[PDB]
Amino acid sequence: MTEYKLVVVGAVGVGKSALTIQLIQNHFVDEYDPTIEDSYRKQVVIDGETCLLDILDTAGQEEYSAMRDQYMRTGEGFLCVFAINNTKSFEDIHQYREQIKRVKDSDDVPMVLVGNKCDLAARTVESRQAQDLARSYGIPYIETSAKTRQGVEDAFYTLVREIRQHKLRKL
Amino acid sequence: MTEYKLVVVGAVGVGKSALTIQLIQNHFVDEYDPTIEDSYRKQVVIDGETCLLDILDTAGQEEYSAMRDQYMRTGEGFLCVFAINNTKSFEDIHQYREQIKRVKDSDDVPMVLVGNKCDLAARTVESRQAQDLARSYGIPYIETSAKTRQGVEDAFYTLVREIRQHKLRKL
Numbered sequence: 320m321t322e323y324k325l326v327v328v329g330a331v332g333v334g335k336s337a338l339t340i341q342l343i344q345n346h347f348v349d350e351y352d353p354t355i356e357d358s359y360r361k362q363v364v365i366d367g368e369t370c371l372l373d374i375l376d377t378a379g380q381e382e383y384s385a386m387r388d389q390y391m392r393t394g395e396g397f398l399c400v401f402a403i404n405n406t407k408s409f410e411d412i413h414q415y416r417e418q419i420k421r422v423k424d425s426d427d428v429p430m431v432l433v434g435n436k437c438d439l440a441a442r443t444v445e446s447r448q449a450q451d452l453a454r455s456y457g458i459p460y461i462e463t464s465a466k467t468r469q470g471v472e473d474a475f476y477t478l479v480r481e482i483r484q485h486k487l488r489k490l
Numbered sequence: 491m492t493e494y495k496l497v498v499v500g501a502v503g504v505g506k507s508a509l510t511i512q513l514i515q516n517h518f519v520d521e522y523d524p525t526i527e528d529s530y531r532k533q534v535v536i537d538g539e540t541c542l543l544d545i546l547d548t549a550g551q552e553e554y555s556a557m558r559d560q561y562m563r564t565g566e567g568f569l570c571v572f573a574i575n576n577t578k579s580f581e582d583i584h585q586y587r588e589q590i591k592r593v594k595d596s597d598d599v600p601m602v603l604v605g606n607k608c609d610l611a612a613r614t615v616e617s618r619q620a621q622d623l624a625r626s627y628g629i630p631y632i633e634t635s636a637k638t639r640q641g642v643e644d645a646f647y648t649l650v651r652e653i654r655q656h657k658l659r660k661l
């Protein structure tokens with residue numbers, strides 16, 4: 320069926336692995352080797368289209384750029400994630416977004432901005448600032464929580480839909 | 491009288507020198523040595539307070555950081571400017587804003603975002619994206635044109651007022 324190659328990107332400790340794993344196997348995982356980078360797949364039905372999700376769970380020292388090259392130029396969409404209680408991870412969103420536009424020759428590649436850990440009752444980054452950023456970038460912003468699972472399907476599926484619109488726009 | 495040390499910052503070719511000079515001597519200047527970095531002063535009355543504006547017109551290769559050190563930690567406010575028809579200068583706004591927060595130990599230093607050259611009927615950066623960015627940063631955005639002079643006083647004076655509020659907030 321159709322196959323979407325997605326890449327999950329963002330600073331270390333934001334919850335990239337917990338989100339990915341929550342999506343694939345429905346269980347929250349804590350303590351998962353910060354170093355391990357691997358792909359994950361799942362057959363899903365989104366909006367009636369059945370498809371294959373090919374997700375790259377990025378890890379490793381790569382100064383805010385292209386963690387896993389031959390997925391990065393080939394990724395069809397990216398999940399830019401930050402933790403809602405870590406302003407740095409948030410401030411670093413710009414750099415990830417610039418390497419992505421950099422290897423892909425465009426400021427028009429499907430992405431979604433993800434504010435993770437919204438279960439934490441605390442916060443150093445607030446909803447309106449994130450969403451203004453997204454609004455300036457032109458992409459959606461969605462808050463999730465790998466822990467309670469809130470928003471994880473909405474985040475990945477919202478990313479699929481963007482890719483879809485983007486493929487239909489060339490006709 | 492009161493004295494405000496302001497720094498004009500941004501990529502080369504955006505109009506930092508034309509704006510500064512337009513403010514100080516009311517005349518548009520084209521072709522002004524991209525390399526020359528110097529300060530400029532003017533006595534003005536803003537909101538009934540008479541004051542001395544001490545402006546640093548930043549120039550020189552300094553990778554998006556602290557052009558003129560002993561003005562940068564001492565600047566009381568910064569004018570972050572980009573050209574409305576130069577998306578790169580615009581995308582680089584983040585880096586300037588991070589060195590400023592970097593030498594000043596805070597994500598709370600008076601700044602104003604300036605979209606210059608609004609006389610050009612063209613544009614690669616649009617009003618709503620700039621303002622969403624500003625809104626996410628928490629600072630004002632003002633469009634100016636060193637050429638026709640539109641907005642140049644509003645930009646500097648709006649920067650003075652921010653500094654004022656910021657000084658009054660400690661009481």
Ligand SMILES: Nc1nc2c(ncn2[C@@H]2O[C@H](COP(=O)(O)OP(=O)(O)O)[C@@H](O)[C@H]2O)c(=O)[nH]1
Pocket residue numbers: 329330331332333334335336337338348349350351352353435436437438439463464465466467
């Ligand atoms: N409270 C809470 N902790 C989370 C959430 N997402 C991830 N974590 C924890 O944050 C840390 C980093 O998660 P991980 O997926 O390994 O981060 P990564 O470096 O982006 O892969 C671990 O302690 C996770 O269990 C979340 O939504 N809520």
Ligand SMILES: Nc1nc2c(ncn2[C@@H]2O[C@H](COP(=O)(O)OP(=O)(O)O)[C@@H](O)[C@H]2O)c(=O)[nH]1
Pocket residue numbers: 500501502503504505506507508509519520521522523524606607608609610634635636637638
């Ligand atoms: N049309 C137009 N050109 C401008 C404007 N501001 C500056 N320029 C021109 O842009 C170039 C760069 O100006 P300058 O102040 O030297 O740029 P800087 O490197 O930021 O100091 C010169 O050609 C200026 O005359 C503006 O508002 N409108």
Ligand SMILES: [Mg+2]
Pocket residue numbers: 335336351352353354355377378
């Ligand atoms: Mg991980």
Ligand SMILES: [Mg+2]
Pocket residue numbers: 506507522523524525526548549
């Ligand atoms: Mg100059």
